[PDB]
């Protein structure tokens, strides 16, 4: 067995490849690339990764991008959760850890949903196998005061586990099961929707291929995603899990938090809300936002996101 990482030839190659001694340029980017390349080269050296293994990994990266799944893989190997862990640690160090917990966004947000006042009905497509669901709650700040005019956005899957704009069967209308509500004067919001079923990775796709190699499933428990925002407060990325889903603590993207599992309550009187049956389920999901730090939101995330027109 041979080791070459700590040799002058290898260190010169890394310096050249990242252009550390180049003209003035993007020093931060060169610093990051040098670190990632150095770590990769050292891992190849330490584990004696063969050329055949490396070229299989290179081939995998081609498939990953061809499938458009790099952000799904980021969820599946815990990187997305890891970013939340680092934001959580920064919040604890600054006393901003008293609100509704964050969790991962996932890769399926779509911008452009219509904003309603107080109540939105977001099931645009018929879904016979999904029962009616009312999600409602109150938004407050950590101080305790309800927040009027706060913007509550949600998105979730249908009974086949698919999201609109990402449904491979093409069966969904634009913005089905996606919507936004401005809270009323008492901080209240309400979504009228249908019950989600859990998501699973595209079985032929790159993420599931890698999970298969690891001996891992690619499934998520049923859940609903949220963005919540409002004047004077930081933007919350969160979700809640559907109580009783047996995958709730075995999510392939590691998103579950014990504070984010509200009760599912059987109700009647559905016709008064325009639901499709008298019997329906209600989930009360109250949300607590944190104030800005020095007038700034130190944890909002910019990433590529889909958009569409109504």
């Amino acid at each position: 067995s041979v080791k070459v990482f700590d040799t002058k030839e290898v260190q010169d190659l890394l310096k050249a490849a990242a252009n550390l001694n180049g003209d003035a340029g993007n020093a931060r980017f060169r610093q990051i690339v040098h670190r990632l390349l150095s770590d990769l080269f050292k891992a190849i050296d330490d584990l004696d990764i063969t050329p055949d293994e490396v070229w299989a990994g290179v081939n995998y990266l081609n498939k990953l991008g061809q499938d458009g799944e790099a952000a799904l893989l980021a969820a599946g190997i815990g990187l997305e959760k890891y970013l939340d862990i680092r934001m959580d640690a920064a919040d604890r160090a600054a006393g901003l850890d008293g609100g509704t917990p964050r969790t991962i966004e996932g890769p399926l947000y779509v911008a452009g949903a219509p904003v309603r006042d107080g109540v939105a009905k977001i099931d645009l497509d018929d879904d016979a196998d999904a029962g009616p669901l009312v999600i409602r709650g109150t938004v407050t700040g950590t101080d305790g005061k309800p927040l009027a005019g706060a913007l509550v956005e949600c998105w979730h899957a249908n009974s086949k586990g698919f999201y609109s704009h990402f449904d491979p069967t093409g069966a969904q209308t634009a913005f089905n099961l996606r919507g936004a509500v401005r809270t009323d004067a008492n901080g209240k919001y309400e979504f009228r929707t249908l019950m989600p079923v859990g998501y699973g990775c595209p079985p032929q796709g790159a993420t599931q291929q890698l999970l298969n190699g690891l001996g891992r499933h690619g499934n998520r428990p049923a859940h609903v995603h949220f963005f919540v925002s409002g004047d004077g407060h930081r933007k919350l990325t969160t979700q809640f899990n559907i109580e009783g889903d047996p995958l709730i603590w075995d999510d392939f993207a590691y998103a579950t938090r014990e504070e984010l599992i509200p009760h599912v309550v059987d109700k009647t009187g559905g016709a008064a809300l325009g639901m499709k049956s008298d019997a329906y389920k209600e989930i009360e999901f109250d949300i607590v936002l944190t104030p800005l730090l020095d007038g700034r939101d130190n944890q909002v995330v910019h990433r590529p996101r889909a958009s569409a027109d109504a």
Copy 2:
């Protein structure tokens, strides 16, 4: 900046994501994934890589695979050269460092070229801007005796810097500038071709995008690729560079070696050889192969490769 990498929560997440403790999955694959993931998480912690930075990297991985350029990036950030450095070290440790030096294959080999005995004309398409070139040499073993019936394959670019089967203009015939010759009884091979000009990355592609961010060019000096094989000997991947190219020691893929820069000789008498002018250039490139180690070729590489019919 927070430091969370060493915490139990993060170490547990890494063990889960790579399924180190599961019964299922490929053991070697889980080990490699855990190492790469652990190193990535530590780098993010150490350099305080922001979520915005991480998601830009994720987006880049999508573009890289969409462009089909993972193998081109592997050459461009020195990973392909690095594999050669590790193979060279193994050969030194085993006493097998006495042949013509290896260099990188690159991503543009195509299997299927018609095999000729002794001499092959490989410029099938006219190319007015490239002058005539003869490449000839003798294949020997490390003992200095000629190897008869050894297979010498070469491939190189036209005057526009493009290879057949990878020419985005579609202008080249199958196997243009791609040869395969079996050496004669005296070990000799000869190719009659045109002079290559250097390759450059697809300018809108992912590899050049990353190089642009580093402040690096994506150009190669003019060169000719070789595979050389023969019974009882290991398969050699190598190249030679055209003497005098201004980029000869500034290859973006770091492939140049001092032993692989043969002298270019001005000749006359081209018409008798079937060349398009009386004056032509000649390059003598002798090749030394190494015998098998314990009956096996311990350095042959299996990677995805194109193929075509003549």
